[PDB]
Structure 1
Amino acid sequence: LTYFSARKGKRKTVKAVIDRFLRLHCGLWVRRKAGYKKKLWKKTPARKKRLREFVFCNKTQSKLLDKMTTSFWKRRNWYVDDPYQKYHDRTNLKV
């Protein structure tokens, strides 16, 4: 996506995925489930909880997001009071 710019000759990120998603340094991605703020009256509690809970993404679209994003979004970041520091690293993963 815009593999070369006219002003600097570099790749360019789509801010859509920035607004929608989040990346962890492991390479994984997380997202808010669709349909979580619409038509809640007819949805049963279990369903709306499935919608409230975050979810990961399979590797195809993970690669899609990684390709369209730049390395600035893939770097390591040391934030304060970040609930995702527990998860920016991976533990007990073989093959």
Structure 2
Amino acid sequence: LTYFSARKGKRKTVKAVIDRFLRLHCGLWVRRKAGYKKKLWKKTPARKKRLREFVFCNKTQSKLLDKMTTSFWKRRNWYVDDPYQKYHDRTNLKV
């Protein structure tokens, strides 16, 4: 990514991450699984059940995505009818 842009001197988000992932405000990143629409004629229904899921990322993976987007995407978004709205907080943690 670009740490200092040539016009403003600001950090730039890579737009692949924005167009492919979802940020929860608790700090978790939601993604699809690779190849949920490719070659499912040869795929058993357990495998296409597993591939059709909203899957989280590892700690290092989530930090690598956090370093590749900026402070706009890290923010509390109070939408009207977001399906993922209930998942923005992490409850009953004992770490």
TM-score by length of 2: 0.97
SS class of match (2:77): coil
Question: Alpha-carbon deviation of 1:87?
Answer: 0.4
- Structure 2: distance between partners of 1:10 and 1:94: 37
Detail structure 1 runs of 4+ shifted over 4 Å in the superposition. Answer: none
Runs of at least 5 residues in structure 2 that lack an aligned partner in the other structure: none
SS class of match (2:61): helix
Question: Alpha-carbon deviation of 1:80?
Answer: 1.3
Runs of at least 5 residues in structure 1 that lack an aligned partner in the other structure: none
Question: Alpha-carbon deviation of 1:38?
Answer: 0.5
SS class of match (1:17): helix
SS class of match (1:8): coil
Q: Which has the higher helix share?
A: 1
TM-score by length of 1: 0.97
Encode CA deviations 1:52-76: one digit per residue, 9 max, x unaligned. Answer: 0110000101000000100100000
Q: How many equivalent pairs are there?
A: 95
1:7-86 equivalent positions in 2, closer than 5 A:
7-86=7-86
CA RMSD of aligned residues (A): 0.6
